[PDB]
Design a protein around this ligand. Sequence first.
Ligand SMILES: C[As](C)(=O)[O-]
Ligand SMILES: C[As](C)(=O)[O-]
Ligand SMILES: [Zn+2]
Ligand SMILES: [Zn+2]
Ligand SMILES: [Zn+2]
Ligand SMILES: [Zn+2]
Lengths: 311, 313
Amino acid sequence: RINTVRGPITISEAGFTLTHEHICGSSAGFLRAWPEFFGSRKALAEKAVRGLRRARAAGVRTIVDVSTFDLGRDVSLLAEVSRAADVHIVAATGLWLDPPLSMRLRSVEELTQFFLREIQYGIEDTGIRAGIIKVATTGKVTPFQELVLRAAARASLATGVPVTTHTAASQRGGEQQAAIFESEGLSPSRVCIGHSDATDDLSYLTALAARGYLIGLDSIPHSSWQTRALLIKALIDQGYTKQILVSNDWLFGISSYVTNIMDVMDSVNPDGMAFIPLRVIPFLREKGIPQETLAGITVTNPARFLSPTLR
Amino acid sequence: GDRINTVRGPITISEAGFTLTHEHICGSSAGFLRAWPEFFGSRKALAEKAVRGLRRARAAGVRTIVDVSTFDLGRDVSLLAEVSRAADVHIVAATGLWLDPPLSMRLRSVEELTQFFLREIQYGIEDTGIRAGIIKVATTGKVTPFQELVLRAAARASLATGVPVTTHTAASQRGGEQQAAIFESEGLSPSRVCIGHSDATDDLSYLTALAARGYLIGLDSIPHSSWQTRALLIKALIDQGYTKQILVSNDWLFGISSYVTNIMDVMDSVNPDGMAFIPLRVIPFLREKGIPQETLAGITVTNPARFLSPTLR
Ligand SMILES: C[As](C)(=O)[O-]
Ligand SMILES: C[As](C)(=O)[O-]
Ligand SMILES: [Zn+2]
Ligand SMILES: [Zn+2]
Ligand SMILES: [Zn+2]
Ligand SMILES: [Zn+2]
C-alpha cells in the first residue's frame, strides 16, 4: 500500500503517476500567514482543482507532491484538492533548499526523527502520512545537506519509503548524492536522482541508471523541451526503461520566487501538469516508442518506486 | 487611540499594568511548532510550561508581556492566546520579520512587505482574528538590502496604524544608529521606536544619544549576562534625565528550537526566575540603589503604555 493524502491505496489504484509535482511552491507557514499573496486560499485551491482535473482528463491518476516542510507544504490543502479533483496525491517529507534555523541546527539523529514522524505518525496534526522523502543538494553537497541525505537514507531504511532528489545536473550532482546514500547502505532502487533532464550529458545519466538509480526526467516543460524529451528515448534505447521516471515539476502557485513568475510559467506552458501526457507521450510515440514502454514508464515504474520495500 | 490589540482582544491602556516589552513564549521558526511539536516534548508540555512561568510573572506583578516573536521566529498566536488566557496575563502579539526570513519573504518588495505587516495589524494573523500590537524588526551589523526593505515597510505600517516598532540590534555594533537613520528617512517619529537589545553594550554615549533623540531604549536582556552591570545601565539613563525613554525586559522564552538543542535547559538553570527576573531581582536592586518607587512604575507601566498606544495615525 502507498500512503496518500486521502489514506492508503493499493499499488494498482495509483495508475498513471506524475512523480515530481507541486500544488504550491512556498515556504513553511507562508500560505496560512499570507494567503492573499495567492489572491486567496480559495483561489489557489480552485486553480489546483481545475489543473488536476485537466491532468486527470489526460489520463493522470496520481501525482507525487514533492513539497517539503520548507517548500511550505500544506497537506490539508493537498487533501482538499485531491478529494475535489479525484486525483490521488502522495505527500513528501524531507527538506529542500530553504531550511529555517530550527531545521539547520538539528543533528542527523534529530532530522531522522522528524522524517520518521511524518512517515510513520503523520504530518502536523492531520494524520496524513508522507509516501516519499524529498531532499536537495547544491554544488558538492554542504555539511547540512549531507546530514539531510543521511537522515533521509535512515528514514527510508526504516520504512521502505523511497527517496527523491533535487540536483543541479549541470554539476553532475547525483554522483555525490549516490555516494552518500550508498555509504548508508541504501539501495539505489530506492532513489530517484531528480532534475536529470537539465543536462545533455547522457554518459552521466546512463552510469547512474546502470547502478540501479531511477532517473527523474522531471522538468521537461521548464525548457528545447523536445531535446529534454529525447533523453527519455536515449535511456529507452540503452535498455534502461525500468529506470525512468517522467514528470513536469509544475505548480499552481509560487511564492518562493519573484512575484508573477506563475503567470510567466503558465503562459509558456499552458498545459501545466497535462504537458507530459498531452505533449511528451505523443512525441515519444511519434518517435517509435511503443505503448507498452510508455505505460511501463508512467505506470509500472512509479508503482515499483513508491511501493514501500526493503528488498 | 487609548486601545491596544492583545491576543484576547482590544484592551484599554489602563489594564496593561506592569508590562515586559520584549519576551517570547517560544523561539522557533515558521511552521515548526505545528510540524514538530515533540521537539518541545509536546505542544501540551510547552503550553503548560509557559502557563507555569507566566503565572509566576503575574504573581510578581506582571500584567502584560509583549511577545516579539515574528512570523519567522515561529510565532503561533493560537498558542499565545491559550497561555495568556490560562495564565491570566495579557500578551501583545507582533508582526514584522526577524533574522530568518524564508525565500517567500526574502524575495518580496517593500510594498509587498508593507501589505503583509498591515494585514497582521489591521485584519489579523493567519485566520485567528488576532491583531498584532507591535512591529518587530531585526538587523545585523550593517543593514543588508533586504533588512532595509523590512525597516522601511515597518516604518510605513507604523505610520498607517500608529503601532510602535521594536528592533533587534547588535549593540556592540551600535546597530541602532543605522536603524534610526532609515526610520527617520521614512518620517517615522523616534517616539514610535524602541531600539532593542541595548543592554548588551557599555557604550553609554551611544545609548544616551539615541534617548536624547526620543527613542525608547530597550534594556531587554538583563538575565542573559554579570546581570548587575546590565541593570546599572537603567540607573545610568535615569541619572542623565532619560527616565521616560527606558524599557526593561528579560527576553526570556519557554521553548527554543532556533538554537542548538538543550539551550533552554541551560538558560533555565541559569535564570530560574524566567520572566519574573525583572520584578523579583532587578526592581528591588534599582530601588536599593535609590531609584524612587515612582520612577520604576513610570518605567514599567507608563513608558510601555505610551509606547503601545497607537499614536499619530
Ligand atoms: C524548482 As523546484 C527545486 O521547486 O522543483
Ligand atoms: C531570542 As532573540 C536572539 O530575538 O533575543
Ligand atoms: Zn527541485
Ligand atoms: Zn520540484
Ligand atoms: Zn533579538
Ligand atoms: Zn527576543
